[PDB]
Amino acid sequence: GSHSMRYFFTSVSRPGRGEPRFIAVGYVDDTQFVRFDSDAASQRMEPRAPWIEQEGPEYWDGETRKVKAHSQTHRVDLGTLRGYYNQSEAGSHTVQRMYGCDVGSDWRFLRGYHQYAYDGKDYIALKEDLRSWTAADMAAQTTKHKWEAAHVAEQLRAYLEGTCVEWLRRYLENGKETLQRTDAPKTHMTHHAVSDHEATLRCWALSFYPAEITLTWQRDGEDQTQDTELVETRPAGDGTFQKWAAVVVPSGQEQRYTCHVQHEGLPKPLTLRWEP
């Protein structure tokens, strides 16, 4: 199946309270493997998975110098964007950056992406073709011209088609036991009498990986959106994910309702039915 390596960067200004917060996080698929935090003891890039710990001091020195370079760019960006939008120095602002590459089952290049946000909103994003930019507003147009002058699109295309996929493959090999596993959802259903007229059926998917999952309810084989609740997929904290879907049903009608579970790790889609 498909794979991804993604890096996530957040910078927050602290008016009248000194240097801005900077946090960097690296993921292969749904697994965190690296972190940097400006508020932490080490002032170094730190490992967060077993299979990255085995990299030499050259890797950690390299990643530390680079994440600090990212930190310095975001520190400048906060000052620049305060100016571009003429905002007061009284208010906290946020810069976010996300980039990475997808590979197909053959571990070859599929797409790259580089996205940048100011205060929770698209600022500038690289297009599918990796040669041209979408700017959100007139201030991002200033950035877009600066980035076209410096040929930033060409530079990122080269990282995303080259270094990005080549280190993704390495990480997949070194982390074979973790990253190349699929854990099927363990499933069960629960039942809560709610009145003399209704009951909740809750369909559970536990201990699954990766995160991507579909839980659907049917009533007599017909897709049922009405009277359903679907919670966001949530970390269990052990590298696995959890989700549930519930439906409120008339008293006595429980057996009319089926829960359908689709996951990469299920050879076949599961059908569950309430069994008392």
Add this chain to the structure above:
Amino acid sequence: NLSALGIFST
């Protein structure tokens, strides 16, 4: 592995 490419300021 972070890029050392294509990381320009705003």
Add this chain to the structure above:
Amino acid sequence: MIQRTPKIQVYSRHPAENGKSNFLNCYVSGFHPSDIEVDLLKNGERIEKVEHSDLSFSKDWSFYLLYYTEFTPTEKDEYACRVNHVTLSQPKIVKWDRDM
């Protein structure tokens, strides 16, 4: 200036068994900006020995964090997650439900 109010889920890592060691999780997601206060409560009292994931964000740029602590559920003890954020006119307490 986008502001998104946090979604809160409080749950255990494993199906709760009374007297059996486990992890209590408070997952906070879909929020902006990033400043957020999260405490895990035992009988309305703050738990000290609490760890958290490194701040990350979703496709829509909204943030998410996991706060977690070792605990042993019993029949009597009430667990909860207290969240504070600029979007909330006061802190939101979400009680742990075994089946949610």
